[PDB]
Amino acid sequence: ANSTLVPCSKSPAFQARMKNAPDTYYFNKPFKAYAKYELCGTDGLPHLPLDRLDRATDVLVPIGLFLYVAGFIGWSGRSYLRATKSASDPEMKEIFIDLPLALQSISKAVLWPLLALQEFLSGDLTARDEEIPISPR
Amino acid sequence: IGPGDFYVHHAIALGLHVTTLVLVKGALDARGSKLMPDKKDFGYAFPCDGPGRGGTCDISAWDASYLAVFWMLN
Amino acid sequence: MQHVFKYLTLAPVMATFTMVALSVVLIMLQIWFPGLQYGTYFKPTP
Amino acid sequence: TLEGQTPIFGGGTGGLLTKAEREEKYVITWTSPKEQVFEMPTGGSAIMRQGKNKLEIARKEYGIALGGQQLRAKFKINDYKIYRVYPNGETQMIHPADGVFPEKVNQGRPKVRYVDRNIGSNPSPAKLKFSGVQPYDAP
Amino acid sequence: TQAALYTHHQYIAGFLMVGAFSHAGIFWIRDYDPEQNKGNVLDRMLRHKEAIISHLSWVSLFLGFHTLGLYVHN
Amino acid sequence: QKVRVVVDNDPVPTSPELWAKPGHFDRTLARGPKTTTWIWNLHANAHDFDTHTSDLEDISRKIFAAHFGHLAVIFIWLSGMYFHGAKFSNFEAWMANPTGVKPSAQVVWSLVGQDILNADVGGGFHGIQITSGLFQLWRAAGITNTFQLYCTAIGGLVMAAIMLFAGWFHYHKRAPKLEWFQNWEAMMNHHLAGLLGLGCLGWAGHQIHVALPVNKLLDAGVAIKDIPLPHEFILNTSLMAELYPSFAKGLVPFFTLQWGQYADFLTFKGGLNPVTGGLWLSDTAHHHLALAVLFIVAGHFYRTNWGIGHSFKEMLDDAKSPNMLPFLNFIGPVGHEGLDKIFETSWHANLSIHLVQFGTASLLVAHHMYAMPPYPYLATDYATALSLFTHHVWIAGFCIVGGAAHAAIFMVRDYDPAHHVNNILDRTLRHRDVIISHLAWVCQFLGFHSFAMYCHNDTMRAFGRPQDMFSDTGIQLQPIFAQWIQHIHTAAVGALGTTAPGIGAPVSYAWGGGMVAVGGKVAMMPIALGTADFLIHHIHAFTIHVTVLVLFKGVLFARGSRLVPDKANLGFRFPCDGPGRGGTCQVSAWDHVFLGLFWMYNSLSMVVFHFSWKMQSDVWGTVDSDGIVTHLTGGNFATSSITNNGWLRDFLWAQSAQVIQSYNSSLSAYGLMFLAGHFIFGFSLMFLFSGRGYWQELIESIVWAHNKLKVAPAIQPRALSIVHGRAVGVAHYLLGGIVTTWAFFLARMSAIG
Amino acid sequence: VERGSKVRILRRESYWYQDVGLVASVDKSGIKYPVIVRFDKVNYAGVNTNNFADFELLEIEKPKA
Amino acid sequence: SHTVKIYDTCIGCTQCVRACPTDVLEMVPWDGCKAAQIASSPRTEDCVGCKRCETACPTDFLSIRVYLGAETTRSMGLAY
Ligand code: CLA
Ligand code: CLA
Ligand code: CLA
Ligand code: CLA
Ligand code: CLA
Ligand code: CLA
Ligand code: CLA
Numbered sequence A: 001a002n003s004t005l006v007p008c009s010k011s012p013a014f015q016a017r018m019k020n021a022p023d024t025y026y027f028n029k030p031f032k033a034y035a036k037y038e039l040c041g042t043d044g045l046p047h048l049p050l051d052r053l054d055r056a057t058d059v060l061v062p063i064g065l066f067l068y069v070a071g072f073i074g075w076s077g078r079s080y081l082r083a084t085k086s087a088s089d090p091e092m093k094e095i096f097i098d099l100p101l102a103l104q105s106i107s108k109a110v111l112w113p114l115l116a117l118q119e120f121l122s123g124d125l126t127a128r129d130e131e132i133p134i135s136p137r
Numbered sequence B: 001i002g003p004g005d006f007y008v009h010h011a012i013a014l015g016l017h018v019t020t021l022v023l024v025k026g027a028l029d030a031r032g033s034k035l036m037p038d039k040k041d042f043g044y045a046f047p048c049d050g051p052g053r054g055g056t057c058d059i060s061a062w063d064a065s066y067l068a069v070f071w072m073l074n
Numbered sequence C: 001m002q003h004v005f006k007y008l009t010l011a012p013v014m015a016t017f018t019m020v021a022l023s024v025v026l027i028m029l030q031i032w033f034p035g036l037q038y039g040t041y042f043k044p045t046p
Numbered sequence D: 001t002l003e004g005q006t007p008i009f010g011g012g013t014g015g016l017l018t019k020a021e022r023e024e025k026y027v028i029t030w031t032s033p034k035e036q037v038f039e040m041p042t043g044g045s046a047i048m049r050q051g052k053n054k055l056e057i058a059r060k061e062y063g064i065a066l067g068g069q070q071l072r073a074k075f076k077i078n079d080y081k082i083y084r085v086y087p088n089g090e091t092q093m094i095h096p097a098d099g100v101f102p103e104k105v106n107q108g109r110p111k112v113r114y115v116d117r118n119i120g121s122n123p124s125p126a127k128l129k130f131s132g133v134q135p136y137d138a139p
Numbered sequence E: 001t002q003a004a005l006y007t008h009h010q011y012i013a014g015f016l017m018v019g020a021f022s023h024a025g026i027f028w029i030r031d032y033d034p035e036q037n038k039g040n041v042l043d044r045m046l047r048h049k050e051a052i053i054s055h056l057s058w059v060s061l062f063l064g065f066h067t068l069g070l071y072v073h074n
Numbered sequence F: 001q002k003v004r005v006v007v008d009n010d011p012v013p014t015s016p017e018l019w020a021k022p023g024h025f026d027r028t029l030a031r032g033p034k035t036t037t038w039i040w041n042l043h044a045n046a047h048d049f050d051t052h053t054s055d056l057e058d059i060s061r062k063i064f065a066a067h068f069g070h071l072a073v074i075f076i077w078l079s080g081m082y083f084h085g086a087k088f089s090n091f092e093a094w095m096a097n098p099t100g101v102k103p104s105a106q107v108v109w110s111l112v113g114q115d116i117l118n119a120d121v122g123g124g125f126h127g128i129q130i131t132s133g134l135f136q137l138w139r140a141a142g143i144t145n146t147f148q149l150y151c152t153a154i155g156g157l158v159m160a161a162i163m164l165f166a167g168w169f170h171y172h173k174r175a176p177k178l179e180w181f182q183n184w185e186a187m188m189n190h191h192l193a194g195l196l197g198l199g200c201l202g203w204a205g206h207q208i209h210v211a212l213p214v215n216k217l218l219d220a221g222v223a224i225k226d227i228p229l230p231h232e233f234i235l236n237t238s239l240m241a242e243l244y245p246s247f248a249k250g251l252v253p254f255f256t257l258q259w260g261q262y263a264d265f266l267t268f269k270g271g272l273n274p275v276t277g278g279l280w281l282s283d284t285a286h287h288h289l290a291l292a293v294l295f296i297v298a299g300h301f302y303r304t305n306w307g308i309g310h311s312f313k314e315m316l317d318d319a320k321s322p323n324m325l326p327f328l329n330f331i332g333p334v335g336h337e338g339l340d341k342i343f344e345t346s347w348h349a350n351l352s353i354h355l356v357q358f359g360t361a362s363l364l365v366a367h368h369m370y371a372m373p374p375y376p377y378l379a380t381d382y383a384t385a386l387s388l389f390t391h392h393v394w395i396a397g398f399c400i401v402g403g404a405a406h407a408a409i410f411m412v413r414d415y416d417p418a419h420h421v422n423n424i425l426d427r428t429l430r431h432r433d434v435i436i437s438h439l440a441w442v443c444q445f446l447g448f449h450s451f452a453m454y455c456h457n458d459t460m461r462a463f464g465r466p467q468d469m470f471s472d473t474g475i476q477l478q479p480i481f482a483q484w485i486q487h488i489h490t491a492a493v494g495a496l497g498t499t500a501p502g503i504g505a506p507v508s509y510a511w512g513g514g515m516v517a518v519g520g521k522v523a524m525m526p527i528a529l530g531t532a533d534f535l536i537h538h539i540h541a542f543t544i545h546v547t548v549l550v551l552f553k554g555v556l557f558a559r560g561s562r563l564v565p566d567k568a569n570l571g572f573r574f575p576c577d578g579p580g581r582g583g584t585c586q587v588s589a590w591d592h593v594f595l596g597l598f599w600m601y602n603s604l605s606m607v608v609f610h611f612s613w614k615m616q617s618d619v620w621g622t623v624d625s626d627g628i629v630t631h632l633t634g635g636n637f638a639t640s641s642i643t644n645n646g647w648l649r650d651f652l653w654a655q656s657a658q659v660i661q662s663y664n665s666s667l668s669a670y671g672l673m674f675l676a677g678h679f680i681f682g683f684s685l686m687f688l689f690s691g692r693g694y695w696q697e698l699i700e701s702i703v704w705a706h707n708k709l710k711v712a713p714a715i716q717p718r719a720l721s722i723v724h725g726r727a728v729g730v731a732h733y734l735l736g737g738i739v740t741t742w743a744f745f746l747a748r749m750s751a752i753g
Numbered sequence G: 001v002e003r004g005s006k007v008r009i010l011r012r013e014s015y016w017y018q019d020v021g022l023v024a025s026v027d028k029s030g031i032k033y034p035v036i037v038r039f040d041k042v043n044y045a046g047v048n049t050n051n052f053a054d055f056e057l058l059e060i061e062k063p064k065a
Numbered sequence H: 001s002h003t004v005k006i007y008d009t010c011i012g013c014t015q016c017v018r019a020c021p022t023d024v025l026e027m028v029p030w031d032g033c034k035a036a037q038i039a040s041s042p043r044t045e046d047c048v049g050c051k052r053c054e055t056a057c058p059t060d061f062l063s064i065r066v067y068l069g070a071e072t073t074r075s076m077g078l079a080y
């Protein structure tokens, strides 16, 4: 078990920072949250360790939350792009956003982790290697 | 080592991967690319292929090694 | 007026609306919940 | 010798240098329907005469630019010729080479430096190592 | 002396690393012929160079965005 | 009869249909995008009106309408400064205590800890200390309360709307003909007598009737609330009579040419007001009144419609041999004949001249406003004084480069060889090798005899041989000619003898005559010149001459050179003419502007560095009760600025302590922007050092990955064009360097100024 | 191939290698590259048409009707 | 001197000949294309290497190629 990291409320250096902090919106509540939940080093500043079986939700929640949002943006853009490929003038739909098409892409992208799974299972996620422009070797 | 050492090692990893990217891209594209399919016939070190096809400054494999020295020094 | 609506769907115009909306959401999150940090999100105020 | 009278020009610093007297020189001659102002290849404005004209130029590109972009395109003059003059006095007519402009196909012109394949079929330089043959010159 | 020796050998190491890839690119143009290397492991590398370069670009982008972003956040 | 107004009626319908057609102004761009280069080309050619159409009349109408739009933008910006100075400022507190309150007109919200930037500027106010000098300008205008600033803000918005309506009206409703724009004589008469002349007269009226009485009371020490409103000085004539007795006899002296009785409020003193450190407002009132008369008289110089006046064409046709001076007859028998054709058709040529003279005007603004501070409590506000000089120096440099840029555009596009046959323009092009070769040599001579002498000093100092240095204590280089001018100008007012007897005080105390202190700080004192000033001035001569060499080579060779004779056909802005002829990269006139921007930045950076160090070292400081002055850097300039190790240590390293230690304080924004400028400078280096061939090939592999996942865009990604990459590199380079100096200057002056 | 056919380019040095084009016309003479193919994506020179031989094309979709 | 080669993919559009600033190229009779003509480079000694011909070539890939070689007075574009 890591011993150089202790709870911030028990760190004398962190406490010194808490008293010397300005009395504004930016410090009153945040220091109280840091003292209860964060682990502080010898410098008195919160540190984020990845060596604890506990507080694993503190790692997985921000990671999963980002990965869902980033995948949502990516799947929205991908589905919209494939929808405009069947148009006569796909370039004009990239400088002029087709709002009915964009809303449809955004609505479906809510379930992107499921959509991507069936996309990969059915083989529709990727194009074949020989059907892709490549440079001479 | 602490948090300060964590960030600088990841900065070093960024430098290693970009310098490798510049060198590997230059080596693998040395024989040719979409912009210049016949690069192998012009040799390792040549200035360019002219302003045509959009412009081809620093297109030779020598230029990738030229660019990689900047990233290696960084 | 239909030309104005078409102009509003331009890529720079839509991107500006999207960035402004996202910045507004992020800004109000800082105002309502300042000092949020990894290991602190979605936890009650002590 | 080359006949023709030089255009009205007060002088300039873009004219001939030691290379003209030592290595080679170029002369462009043409005929114009009237006296008119044209731009010198190396800056400045000159007045071309009524009859046949003769201009001394340092480089062949000066004659091609003057004859092509100005004489033909602007003044509708198509009888211009470019000569290469050596210091010993030898003069040879080089443009147009056979009396017909190069952009117009002419019978009797042979194929020069023609490769009987597409550019993507050039051999790799490895197969021609130490042979002294470039891939584009390979048979 | 310790500072000089570490900096000396690290910088020389960077130059040698650049040279290894520089002459790798020279090999592709001058010494590599696809006929005698048809189907082998060296030929396979050239056949998926786009995947290699694009993934190296992704690692470089990920490291650069997050390392710089966390530095300026601090 | 010749000068008359002719317009078209409804030449362009007012419809938003073309708003949904990006690139409609260009034939190539109208087809729509196929690659990402289309997007960049759309913005690059947006305001290149002469490429939208070949009709000069239509081009001129676009110029006139767009200028109204820019005026509206300026009015909105001006309205913002007045409104922020009336709603989020400490202007009223500053007016009560000008010497003890830092001006501030920007207040930040409190969301992410950025409220730490609300500095304690005094007067019970928290905000960012402004360095624009708005408070000092408003005080000199007689403004004393935030309500007057609020009214000016409303007026600025109204004028912005009027400007916007004028541009729409004069393009979509009543567009003047080409002949209307070609009225040189009418335009010169109206802009001299009516714009400059009547504006000076109007401001002289405001100064006499409003600014002078309010500021006279302010310097007397009476409170703000006891000062009557400016209109009371107009209604109650007795109030003006008490301050200035000459107002008791009305306008009679003016109409009888007895102007000497107006000397009590139209003064000719010179020097500075001891109370505030600025120029006497009565001096400026007579200055602007004299300017109004001179400009109005100048406005009756050109012949419009009544036979009286001078003609532009007749002068230019007459300025030739043998009508010139005997030693000036070399301009040839044609001379200025044919130049009138340039001003008939070339907008770019006029823009070239006007951008140059805006550089001249802004440089005069920078130099003449620190040595003769015109606003009250401006000289002692060191943060504002440094910012104002630096800002207007930089504006001038960009304007000068723009003048050279559009001079080259005129040569490529508007120059006609038929119009210039043996005239001065033709002759100048015909000895361009004479001009450039001599300019190249003098640049080399200046570089050796200005910068290499600094290197000589560094080597001598490192050797421990100070006696061999170029310094006041070694081998002296006294600027005797500049020292002589200071003595002549000081002795002219009585402080080659008394050549300006009517001036009481020295025109500028920088030339000598004494010291002025206001709030325990030096406003202006004599600026002695020694070896260090000799060296730094010839550094400026070197950098300016090289910048001239880069730009003037581009203009003189824009049509072509011995290397590429047909550059005019290639255009003003092209990347190269291939790797042939040994390599023809950056031969275009645009690339000479691109290179000239770097040299303008290098030249002007040393100009503002020279000003910042010299003023801190030898002028600015605090004065004790005994009259002894301790300067901000304690006289470092004489001994430390003669080596660039001294510049590196005693100027860059030492004076960056404020910006480098500004974290966890109200100046922390300057510390952040100090790093921000450093980042952008390094960021620009890859656009400048690399080429698009590498980046296009790299994009090929990235495109392959998107193709693999069926997410490739229809608008094909392309690397930036060769010219575009250069433009990005120079833009980020200049932004990074200038922002770095901006944070460095402002952080130090906000702390020690 | 024939007019209106959908083809895949097999010329290695072509910008449209392994890409898809539409046949615009076929020349019946004995010229080396009689088939004219048009593409939706322009190459680096802005050109969206090229001439190919029969052995450099792969038929992937017959022309309509 | 530079080396200019013309490959069989030429369509005889004469664009390269028109773009040459030193008259290196000319159009000669041919039977490999519909235009019944092909580009030729008889005067490569006057070639400066500007690669204007390659820019004008519409074929993909290029039917005319310029390989920079030994540098002479006229290939360097020297008026002195
Ligand atoms: C005395 C008459 C007069 C005055 C004052 C002006 C003033 C101006 N002209 Mg102008 N002009 C005139 C006559 C006049 N012109 C004539 C007769 C012609 C035909 C030959 C032109 C042709 C002309 C062209 C082609 C262009 C101008 C432009 C300009 C502007 C230059 C930018 C500047 O300095 O901003 C000065 C900044 C200001 C805020 C000045 C105030 C602006 C308003 C419009 C002035 C209104 C004054 C009016 C008398 C009301 C006074 C109220 C009160 C004081 C009593 C400026 C506003 C340029 C421009 O930008 O156009 C928009 C331009 O391109 N003029
Ligand atoms: C009265 C001033 C004035 C006017 C009317 C013009 C007008 C013109 N100029 Mg010009 N110019 C000026 C001053 C002026 N210039 C100055 C002072 C310089 C020196 C820097 C130049 C340098 C210059 C060059 C080098 C070129 C022109 C060109 C042009 C023409 C096309 C305009 C264009 O490309 O749109 C402008 C379109 C843009 C996309 C530019 C905007 C991008 C800027 C650089 C961003 C600036 C950064 C910002 C201020 C700070 C950071 C922002 C933040 C978000 C980080 C047009 C006739 C071009 C041309 O073809 O002329 C025929 C051309 O090649 N000018
Ligand atoms: C449409 C959305 C979209 C999607 C799904 C992808 C997907 C991918 N990109 Mg990518 N990219 C995009 C847009 C997108 N890109 C744009 C707009 C740019 C230009 C800035 C790039 C520039 C880019 C580079 C330079 C690289 C990738 C790479 C990659 C791959 C892995 C890394 C990654 O996710 O990118 C991370 C994301 C970025 C680098 C920038 C994209 C962020 C943009 C601003 C989001 C745009 C969202 C869009 C506007 C949504 C509109 C939809 C609406 C109409 C409904 C992956 C295949 C890498 C690769 O090849 O790995 C193998 C790589 O090197 N991309
Ligand atoms: C054992 C090590 C080794 C060996 C045997 C070689 C051998 C070779 N290299 Mg190579 N190289 C090496 C290490 C090595 N390299 C490293 C470490 C790098 C990375 C920097 C490179 C980068 C490199 C490039 C980029 C190129 C070569 C090339 C070549 C070949 C021709 C050499 C040349 O251009 O003429 C002799 C070259 C010189 C004498 C260069 C001048 C000196 C340079 C500019 C350094 C500047 C001097 C400096 C101020 C002081 C140095 C000390 C002084 C005493 C010189 C040759 C087969 C070239 C080639 O094959 O072309 C196809 C080529 O283009 N190499
Ligand atoms: C400070 C200098 C600097 C910086 C920051 C970069 C940054 C980068 N270089 Mg680079 N380079 C530089 C100098 C620099 N270079 C120099 C001097 C050279 C020598 C010529 C090179 C040569 C070079 C090569 C040869 C290559 C790179 C590559 C890269 C990228 C890989 C790193 C990455 O993806 O991180 C993430 C990206 C960044 C850190 C960039 C900054 C992102 C900003 C901060 C986002 C801000 C967004 C914000 C809204 C913008 C404000 C609005 C604004 C538009 C007005 C990255 C964009 C490689 C590449 O493209 O790989 C994909 C590559 O192949 N560079
Ligand atoms: C010679 C011209 C000149 C000078 C020296 C001054 C001087 C002054 N004015 Mg003033 N002004 C002028 C013309 C001038 N004005 C004109 C024409 C107008 C509009 C019609 C105004 C309107 C005005 C207002 C509204 C205010 C001032 C104020 C001031 C004072 C503040 C300092 C300042 O403005 O910078 C001094 C400026 C300079 C040293 C240089 C700028 C002068 C012009 C632009 C240069 C023109 C020459 C040019 C480069 C060459 C042309 C080419 C050639 C072929 C002819 C100061 C006493 C302020 C005040 O009250 O102070 C207390 C104030 O509020 N002025
Ligand atoms: C500190 C870096 C630096 C230096 C020293 C130079 C030096 C020079 N540049 Mg330059 N330049 C630079 C950076 C630099 N540049 C950058 C970053 C850019 C990009 C914008 C440019 C862009 C640029 C352009 C566009 C132009 C120049 C020009 C010039 C020359 C001006 C004439 C001159 O001063 O001659 C005197 C030479 C010097 C002052 C150099 C230093 C000499 C040292 C101090 C003394 C040496 C003593 C002795 C001779 C050593 C010999 C010993 C032996 C063993 C070797 C000169 C060679 C101009 C030119 O060629 O005009 C004629 C020109 O047109 N440069």
Ligand SMILES: CC1=C(C/C=C(\C)CCC[C@H](C)CCC[C@H](C)CCCC(C)C)C(=O)c2ccccc2C1=O
Pocket (backbone or CB within 6 Å): F686, F687, F688, F690, F691, F692, F695, F696, F718, F719, F720, F721, F722, F724, F725, F726
């Ligand atoms: C880096 C580089 C490139 C690559 C740069 C490219 C392709 C331009 C990329 C521009 C991007 C797409 C603009 C948008 C970038 C923003 C930071 C995105 C903001 C996203 C928000 C969500 C924050 C060149 O093309 C080039 C060409 C010639 C000489 C030098 C260079 C050069 O140095």
Ligand code: SF4
Pocket (backbone or CB within 6 Å): B047, B048, B049, B050, B051, B055, B056, B057, B058, F575, F576, F577, F578, F579, F580, F583, F584, F585, F586, F691, F722
């Ligand atoms: S600008 Fe680029 S393409 Fe043009 S000659 Fe130079 S390196 Fe070659």
Ligand code: SF4
Pocket (backbone or CB within 6 Å): H006, H009, H010, H011, H012, H013, H014, H015, H016, H017, H038, H039, H053, H056, H057, H058, H059, H063, H064
């Ligand atoms: S430009 Fe290309 S296709 Fe046209 S004639 Fe020349 S080589 Fe043949």
